[PDB]
Nucleic acid binder design. Structure first.
Ligand SMILES: [K+]
Ligand SMILES: [K+]
Ligand SMILES: [K+]
Ligand SMILES: [K+]
Ligand SMILES: [K+]
Ligand SMILES: [K+]
Ligand SMILES: [K+]
Ligand SMILES: [K+]
Ligand SMILES: [K+]
Ligand SMILES: [K+]
Ligand SMILES: [K+]
Ligand SMILES: [K+]
Ligand SMILES: [K+]
Ligand SMILES: [K+]
Ligand SMILES: [K+]
Ligand SMILES: [Mg+2]
Ligand SMILES: [Mg+2]
Ligand SMILES: [Mg+2]
Ligand SMILES: [Mg+2]
Ligand SMILES: [Mg+2]
Ligand SMILES: [Mg+2]
Ligand SMILES: [Mg+2]
Ligand SMILES: [Mg+2]
Ligand SMILES: [Mg+2]
Lengths: 131, 386, 62
RNA sequence: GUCUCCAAGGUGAACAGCCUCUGGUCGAUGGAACAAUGUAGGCAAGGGAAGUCGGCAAAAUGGAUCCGUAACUUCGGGAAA
RNA sequence: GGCUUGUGGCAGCCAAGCGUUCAUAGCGACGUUGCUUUUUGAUCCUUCGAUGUCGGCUCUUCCUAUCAUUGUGAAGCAGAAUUCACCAAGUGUUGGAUUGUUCACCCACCAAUAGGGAACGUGAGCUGGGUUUAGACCGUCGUGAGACAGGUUAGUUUUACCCUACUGAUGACAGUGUCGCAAUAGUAAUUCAACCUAGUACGAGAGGAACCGUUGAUUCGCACAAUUGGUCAUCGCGCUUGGUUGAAAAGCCAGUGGCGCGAAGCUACCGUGCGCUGGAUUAUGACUGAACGCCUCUAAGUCAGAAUCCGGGCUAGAAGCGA
């Protein structure tokens, strides 16, 4: 197909989101967003399907006190689909991945957005329900 | 010393001064280049902003994620009744630029057009063009008119027609004073241009004679007025901290010590809105012709019998009954504002410009609220009153 | 034929280019006609107790 | 800024706040409009201190009834934890 | 601020040497010529009947000694990457932890996170954390009052209605009105990713591009409200506390009593639409062609040539003008 269309950003830096993967982390604390060139005073922000740098605040000791990549799979901020329907999730969630985009865990606890599944084949394969 | 951090400047210096436009009707600043190998054809048109709705269509764009998928897009409806041609103007090429050489008017002028020449039409004696009209009654007068047209053919380099809107056809507008504009004639020789203009005297020119579906056009008009405005909203400067003595909606430093003057590049509070603008590349999604089955909002997919006008009428505008253009996106000005339509000055070869759009659904629900019905009959059936 | 969705709160008719979609934590998809229905749903108001909803009318045989 | 006497009804623990009766009073130069900037008072989707020297300001909590309450302690407290 | 430039910073010249050989791809010891005033000094010319004294925040503009981006020459340039140099200041140069900090040091993103001026830009623009009054504590010094290029805590930021500048607003421009021309001034677009090219060129392997084309995105600019979101004194409807009108019904008071929903208008990268192409040329590479019978991009003549300049387009429209 083509390329992802822009969607409303609702997770600026310092946002804490649930961890939907099986790694053992409970939440993800976003410290930066990949691909952001930015502007003065503007906080980098991520959306569903974006890759971010995050740390684990609650979880196994092995996962804490370090920086790892993560991909956002759910967001509460509504965004507009090309068909005109605005949609949103119940919570904010993400999954830990390696820089190549491979999931560190093996399963996803809840649903994931279609954009993230289209962008990341491994996450889609590990997902239960898309949208 | 150098500014601590770099960010782009607020606002554009290319739309200076941010003053009230010296006009209410959009002015065509540059007409499309004339190619004499094509048939004579008009280059511009006058319309009226009726309102906005949204449409759904299947997108044909290979390589795009929307390929063979539905997309919802906002559109603007512009009512474009046929224009009446009432004169011809010819200009001469000179070292100082184009100079108007002579103007020839038609014998009969409607009251709507003549209203444009008065400030108080009702109180006046209505003498405009009365002696000019008599030139068509005497043989020497017609001979003189033909001589003027011959001179226009001989000496003119660009030919423009004088056309005015039939404004009283849109009762939603409370205006009987028609809008008059000069529309350039492109194509053919100068004599051909003059003959084309003269043959249309006291005759209507439909909008489809200038534009067509899927064509990219430009819209010229005056933006919505907002009056006196501060820098934060007028220019987009950032707010100062909460604890700023004497207000925070300001530019903190309006200049350095030297030069010892405030420069034109610093944001200042002033008039906002009511500015002349020219917007490019507005695609035409449909051309509704009155009483031709194209005026209705019925599509191939949706066969519901309904008109373009939404339930309860177009807010602040009225009911669209004449020809209209459905343009993708938004256009300048508030509702009822007269907008000038301009043929593209560029060569449209891009895939987007060449795309053949097929409308699938046109929303006609009430825009004065969260409209849930497409037709009044549907609502009446829903509530058991039909 | 035009394809249409239904609001899960008011049972109303939703036409193309409109509607609000809410995805619950259990992957349940809720589609609302307008902001009124969405706000009432998130306020935990039961549609069957609101007179104007389709569910109420069906339950009361209106 | 300047001492003191009298002190109704309702709500409510309450000469708290809010409304009312007796008594007093509408005295603060008036009219039109509703630009910017201000002063005073609110709200704001997603994020939640990333702002800032600093959580400044604001928000959050708040009454009553029942359950329950850690370290430490001068054994009295902490505690409305 | 002014003179100067020791000191700081930035360049050049010679060529002993380094660079598997080879002074000059890339460097340049011993010496030696310069430039700059974002270092610090030297001085004391201006200001002591007062020019508000650090830093940060905001905002504009300017410079090049160019970090990235456009176009090029060179290499100890196979590719990839890198390095040296040339036109080049059009565009951009970020989010954070500690510190009052300038400075510094780390985390992160990015094409890049270059260096600087504008009275060490900017306090009747803010702030006041630091320095730098009066309170107070510590250490050292002093017999003492007290001191301290040591540390600590608390400590009032005044005035614009004048002139100019700037932003917009009337008016003037020799009847009135309509439609127009037009000097001149301003100006704007920017960068990145993905697919294909292609696991191809190149390379023993390892590794590993690019043009065209397609689809998106970043920053910025101008508008707009069909949808979503925000906003309530629609005081629009409903609910509800206390009081009050004998009760019911119906209202009122608590400066918007409070709550839920809330149309309209306004409004957000929190929503949507749009954002442009002819000429002349820089560096460079070349054509024909002497000087100089050969050679030579140059001397005469000529060509291609850029995020460059000009025009066009867009904004305004002059003691300018036409029909
Ligand atoms: K960045
Ligand atoms: K500065
Ligand atoms: K701000
Ligand atoms: K903080
Ligand atoms: K600090
Ligand atoms: K020096
Ligand atoms: K001195
Ligand atoms: K002095
Ligand atoms: K700072
Ligand atoms: K104090
Ligand atoms: K005249
Ligand atoms: K120009
Ligand atoms: K609207
Ligand atoms: K609204
Ligand atoms: K030659
Ligand atoms: Mg900042
Ligand atoms: Mg800079
Ligand atoms: Mg509406
Ligand atoms: Mg009681
Ligand atoms: Mg060598
Ligand atoms: Mg240079
Ligand atoms: Mg620059
Ligand atoms: Mg002693
Ligand atoms: Mg110019």
């Amino acid at each position: 197909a083509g390329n992802k269309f822009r969607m409303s950003l609702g997770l600026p830096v310092a946002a804490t989101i649930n961890c939907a993967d099986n790694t053992g982390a409970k939440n993800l604390y976003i410290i930066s967003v990949k691909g952001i060139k930015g502007r003065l005073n503007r906080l980098p922000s991520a959306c569903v399907g974006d890759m971010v740098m995050a740390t684990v605040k609650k979880g196994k000791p092995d996962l804490r006190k370090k920086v790892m990549p993560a991909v956002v799979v759910r967001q509460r901020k509504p965004w507009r689909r090309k068909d005109g329907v605005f949609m949103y999730f119940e919570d904010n969630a993400g999954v830990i991945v390696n820089p190549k985009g491979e999931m560190k865990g093996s399963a996803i606890t809840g649903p994931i957005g279609k954009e993230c599944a289209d962008l990341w084949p491994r996450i889609a394969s590990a997902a239960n329900a898309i949208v | 010393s150098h500014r601590k951090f770099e960010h782009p400047r607020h606002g554009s210096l290319g739309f200076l001064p941010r003053k009230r436009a010296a006009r209410h009707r959009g002015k065509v600043k540059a007409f499309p280049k004339d190619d004499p190998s094509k048939p004579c054809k008009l280059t511009a048109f006058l319309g009226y902003k009726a309102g906005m709705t949204h449409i759904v269509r299947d997108v044909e764009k290979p390589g795009s994620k929307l390929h063979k998928k539905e997309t919802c897009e906002a559109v603007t409806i512009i009512e474009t009744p046929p224009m009446v041609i009432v004169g011809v103007v010819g200009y001469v090429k000179t070292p100082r630029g184009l100079r108007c050489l002579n103007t020839v008017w038609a014998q009969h002028l409607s009251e709507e057009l003549k209203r444009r020449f008065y400030k108080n039409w009702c109180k006046s004696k209505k003498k405009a063009f009365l002696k000019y009209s008599k030139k068509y009654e005497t043989d020497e007068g017609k001979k003189d008119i033909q001589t003027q047209l011959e001179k226009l053919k001989k000496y003119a380099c660009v030919i423009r027609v004088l056309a005015h809107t039939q404004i009283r056809k849109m009762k939603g507008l409370k205006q009987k004073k028609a809008h008059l504009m000069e529309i350039q004639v492109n194509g053919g020789t100068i004599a051909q241009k003059v003959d084309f203009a003269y043959g249309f005297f006291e005759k209507q020119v439909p909008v489809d004679a200038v534009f067509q579906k899927d064509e990219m056009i430009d819209i010229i008009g005056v933006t919505k007025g907002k009056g006196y405005e501060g820098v934060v909203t007028r220019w987009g400067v950032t707010r100062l901290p909460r604890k700023t003595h004497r207000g925070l909606r300001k530019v903190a430093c309006i200049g350095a010590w030297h030069p010892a003057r405030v420069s034109y590049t610093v944001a200042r509070a002033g008039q906002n809105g009511y500015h002349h603008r020219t917007e490019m590349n507005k695609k035409v999604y449909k051309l509704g012709k009155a009483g031709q089955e194209s005026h209705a909002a019925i599509t191939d997919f949706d066969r519901t019998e309904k008109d373009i006008t939404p339930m309860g009428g177009f807010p602040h505008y009225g009911v669209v009954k004449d020809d209209y253009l459905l343009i993708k996106g938004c256009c300048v000005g508030p509702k009822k504002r007269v907008v000038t339509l301009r043929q593209s000055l560029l060569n449209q070869t891009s895939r987007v410009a060449l795309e053949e759009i097929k409308l699938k659904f046109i929303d006609t629900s009430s825009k004065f609220g969260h409209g849930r019905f497409q037709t009044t009959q549907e609502k009446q059936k829903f509530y058991g009153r039909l | 034929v035009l394809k249409t969705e239904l609001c899960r709160f008011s049972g109303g008719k939703i036409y193309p280019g409109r509607g609000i979609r809410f995805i619950r934590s259990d992957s349940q998809v809720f589609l609302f006609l307008n902001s009124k229905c969405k706000r009432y749903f998130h306020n935990r108001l039961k549609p069957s107790k609101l007179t104007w909803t389709a569910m109420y009318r069906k339950q009361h045989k209106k």
